[PDB]
Amino acid sequence: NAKVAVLGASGGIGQPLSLLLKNSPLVSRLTLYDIAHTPGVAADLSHIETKAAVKGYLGPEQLPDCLKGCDVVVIPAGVPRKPGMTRDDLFNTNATIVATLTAACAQHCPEAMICVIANPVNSTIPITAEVFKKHGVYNPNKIFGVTTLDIVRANTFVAELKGLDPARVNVPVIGGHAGKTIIPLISQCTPKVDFPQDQLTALTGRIQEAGTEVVKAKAGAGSATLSMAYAGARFVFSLVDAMNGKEGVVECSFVKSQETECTYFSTPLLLGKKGIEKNLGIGKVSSFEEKMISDAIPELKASIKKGEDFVKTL
Amino acid sequence: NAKVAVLGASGGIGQPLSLLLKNSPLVSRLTLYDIAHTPGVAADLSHIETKAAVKGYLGPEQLPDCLKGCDVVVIPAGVPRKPGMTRDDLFNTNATIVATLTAACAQHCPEAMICVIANPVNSTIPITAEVFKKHGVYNPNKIFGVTTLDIVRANTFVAELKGLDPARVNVPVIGGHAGKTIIPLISQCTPKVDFPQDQLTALTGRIQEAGTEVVKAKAGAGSATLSMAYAGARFVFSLVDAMNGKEGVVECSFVKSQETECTYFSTPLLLGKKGIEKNLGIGKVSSFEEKMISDAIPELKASIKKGEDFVKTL
Amino acid sequence: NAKVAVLGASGGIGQPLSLLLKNSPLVSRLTLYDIAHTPGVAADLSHIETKAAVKGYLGPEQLPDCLKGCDVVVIPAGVPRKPGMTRDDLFNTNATIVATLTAACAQHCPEAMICVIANPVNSTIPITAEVFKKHGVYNPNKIFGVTTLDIVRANTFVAELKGLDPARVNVPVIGGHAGKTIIPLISQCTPKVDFPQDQLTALTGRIQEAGTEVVKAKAGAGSATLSMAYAGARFVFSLVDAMNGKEGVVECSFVKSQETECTYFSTPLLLGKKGIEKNLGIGKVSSFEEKMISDAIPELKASIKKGEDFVKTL
Amino acid sequence: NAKVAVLGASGGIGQPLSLLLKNSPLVSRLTLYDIAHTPGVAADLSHIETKAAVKGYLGPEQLPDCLKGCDVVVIPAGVPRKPGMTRDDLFNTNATIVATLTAACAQHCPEAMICVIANPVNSTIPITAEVFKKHGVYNPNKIFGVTTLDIVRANTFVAELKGLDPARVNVPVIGGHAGKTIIPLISQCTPKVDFPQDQLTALTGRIQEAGTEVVKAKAGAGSATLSMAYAGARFVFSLVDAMNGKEGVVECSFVKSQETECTYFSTPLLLGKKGIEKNLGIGKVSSFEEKMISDAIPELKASIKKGEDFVKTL
């Protein structure tokens, strides 16, 4: 009976993500928010033969109604990358979008789980946390930077190389969601896979630049939308299952962390009724992986500080 | 091991449809075709952690490679309606789209199931049949006008009025997919439901005008996309399940028919390995429903004739 | 110093039309209406260094304010053709667009000049007249079907074949704005030009199908936008000049006519203070041109009737 | 008699820009380039009754033929801003677009006037100059960063505040084309205008933020298009008049400069037959304006080095 709000529901990620949420038996209310086209999207989705009651909200003054009583808020809202761009090129747009939307959450559903998809996640999660702090409703266990697409890609690519079914493969991916901050722990993969170093390096790079590959392939028509909707759905389903009492629910996510010198970090998380039940940490890693962690730290801390300073100067 | 082709995979219906197909363990090869954007849509979907091999195809030259060895072809391609349009207003443009694509189907995958979403279905299915006849590969058991969205809508509206879970409501809808040719058999609904006659007439009008309601609500930005993808995906899944020998799979679909004086007509169909296992027919209906059947036949015959005559001139 | 309203200012025709009107010293006030994007379009245009005051209006609630005190209303609003479509395929959409917008003109600026670009013009002008008759403010001297693009095309194609400067070529085109109802009076061309009948026939058919040529060239991205904006601007400028007292201003336009048995017809019109100052008629024509007039009359009457019938069913 | 090329002719700026150029008796040949839609845009424009011959070009193979013999090349190509972005945020996409297109210009029309609209102009002109240096054909009197829209805005806003005819207002705007680098010299306005301080300050800021105000007004649907087309056309016309021997033609533009320590800077330029006849420099300015020049220099230098560093890493 979860009520889930989707902020940015009319966008490229928003529309398919809303479809996947509408199709789920875990959702009973699905409220949709955007600044255009939301009523047509809700009308469209409300015809689908599932129990979730759908409502489309349009414009800032309707945002409180969309958020009230929400258990989960997903935020796919944001401008997508075009060819050549870094995710940080979209910092200024998406930071103001994330700060505005998360401020509305802090006021109107402070208790809800906040799942941020909007990039750069390495900065937008710090932004979300600081905004909740300013409203005095800060709960580190309920703020999630959705990195699930990195895990999803890692599983697919390992499966392809080893001729496995991607559904049966699980690769923990830690760090953050940008370039070399994306650290796939192939040493912790289930099933165990043995790659020689040249293939491991090629596989790791592929995972790290996978978003850029899609941007390139779309040749100006944006970034990952459909696979991001899949990954976004997956994480929200994991979270809702855990909120309903399902045990042993583990997902990697970029959260307020105590695992490294970074105040924010993605690790495997045991999920439960109050969000993060336990941070499972990095665990045992190879020299290759340890070296990637070390090299990721400066960029992560820089991205965190940029997110923090953006909010603190509002 | 279903090899599925989606013709029009980059459109508003095509993209979320391809996503849902990619998410299913029934599909092992997903080939996507359009005149633009397909490599990007394919790159996007190829990252999802399911077994389906995704491949994008672009331009008439690559159409035969997209269709090579396909078991099923779904055709979401077509110009969508704007407010104040009938589906028949799109006949002229969509008829030549369908005739071109179905011709390629008859040349390169004549044995495949052909699932036409492209509207107006009442005319475009006849076009498909005639095109297949011109290539001498006509199988009436394998050509389906996807009307599933009318059933999905009927199920949802009945469920909302009776306070039921729409996932366990089943309303047969017969006739065709246009205005008063859409005939919901509320009398055959399971579980059994009873409305006062005035409420029945309102429910029935709503179901008939449901497509238009979404068009109006989208205010010029096209017609149903997400619900149409859900409905198209459900039909393909039903069909593919039956092809794997699943029993008791029933879907309404606009097909070659000997149930009325209309050469094509939609009724509940038992699906099997060959395609249509058995047309389950119209069955016992109310006087109200029999009145609607009688009223619809003129329009259907005109739509069928229109489609047949179009193929005459090629 | 005319106040000019553009209804459908955000569309493909409307934006560049609005630009050309904004650039003209004949326009002191420019009001822009649409259902989306108008505020942005007006903000954009308001930065241009000309005297015209620009204001954007969004949605029906702001439509009366847009029309208040207008001297001219230009109506580029309307759905454009795609490959394979006829202009009549768009009758249903554009007929209800024109009916809604002209009804607002009748109520809020009944004395304004009404310039309809919305196709098919052969029907939408009858619709406009009947809608104005319903409101009891019908003035047939102020209602114009914009056929100017036909004249502009004929001038260009004649000039290209004869190696002339198009600016010095004037070709009267009479009849209507669709297919074989478009009748270029090459015998009345200035300067005088001689063509062999096979060339004349080719030239004539080129003019008649010139819109279809552009729709083909755009391959799904719509119909003439930029050349139509030029033609609409030219007609509005001619009309406004004439309203300011300029003498000898002649433009062909589809209007209430008694030049033939067709109740509406396009001929050269002397424009002036009251709009249509004088209908100059068909004049002297060749036997070839005479044949075309006769061949065209049946389609014109059908299109006129079709438009009148549509208004009665409201 | 001028031959003008437009690179990016299918975009929001390109199309209305192409229309304005086609409408001008100064243009005898108009060549249009883009990676999509150019044949349709060209077909559309070719119907207009002006002497300019219009040809559409499509794909890398045809770019050289678009450019050969050109007197002027205008480059509106590029991704536009969305609300909350700086122009600098688009650097990583538009840098490689400008690099590629200006390399083609240096190869196929090195003696043409190169007019870069593509933003951020403060960085993309340095790119253009470095690309021309690599090809050994760098002429600083023929490369122009198009800042004309800033002047057009300044003229309009000044005219609105004082109740003047904007056609009679000419405000010099110096520096560059981004936020605080845009420096309107109101002290040098003709006619001479006196503003109280609070209006002067609000006027100056309005001019500096004018781009963002249009982006905000468009609510995600891009940046200025129609006014940018106007401004780009005006600049091309000024250049062409000067090439035709007209005296006293002065335009501000961002060019190679020795006015400040910035290697590129915008000042009023006397234009001649070979492009820049004479840089008229900053001249006498107020203390308020001198401060704005001081404040602008650090940002310009960083934007300049960024453009230079981009080319050095190819």
Swiss-Prot record, chains A, B, C, D:
Q: Mainly localized where? A: mitochondrion
Organism expressing this protein natively: Homo sapiens
Q: How does it assemble?
A: Homodimer.
One GO BP = gluconeogenesis
Know the name of this protein?
Answer: Malate dehydrogenase, mitochondrial
UniProt modified residues of type N6-acetyllysine: 55, 68, 142, 162, 192, 216, 273, 278, 284, 291, 301, 305-306, 312
Q: What class of enzyme is it?
A: oxidoreductase
Checking InterPro entries in the record gives: L-lactate/malate_DH (IPR001557), Lactate/malate_DH_C (IPR022383), Lactate/malate_DH_N (IPR001236), Lactate_DH/Glyco_Ohase_4_C (IPR015955), Malate_DH_AS (IPR001252), Malate_DH_type1 (IPR010097), NAD(P)-bd_dom_sf (IPR036291)
The disorder on record is: Developmental and epileptic encephalopathy 51: A form of epileptic encephalopathy, a heterogeneous group of severe early-onset epilepsies characterized by refractory seizures, neurodevelopmental impairment, and poor prognosis. Development is normal prior to seizure onset, after which cognitive and motor delays become apparent. DEE51 is an autosomal recessive form characterized by onset of intractable seizures and hypotonia in the first days or weeks of life, and severely delayed psychomotor development.
Kindly list the positions annotated as binding substrate: 81, 87, 119, 153
- What is the active site of this protein? 177
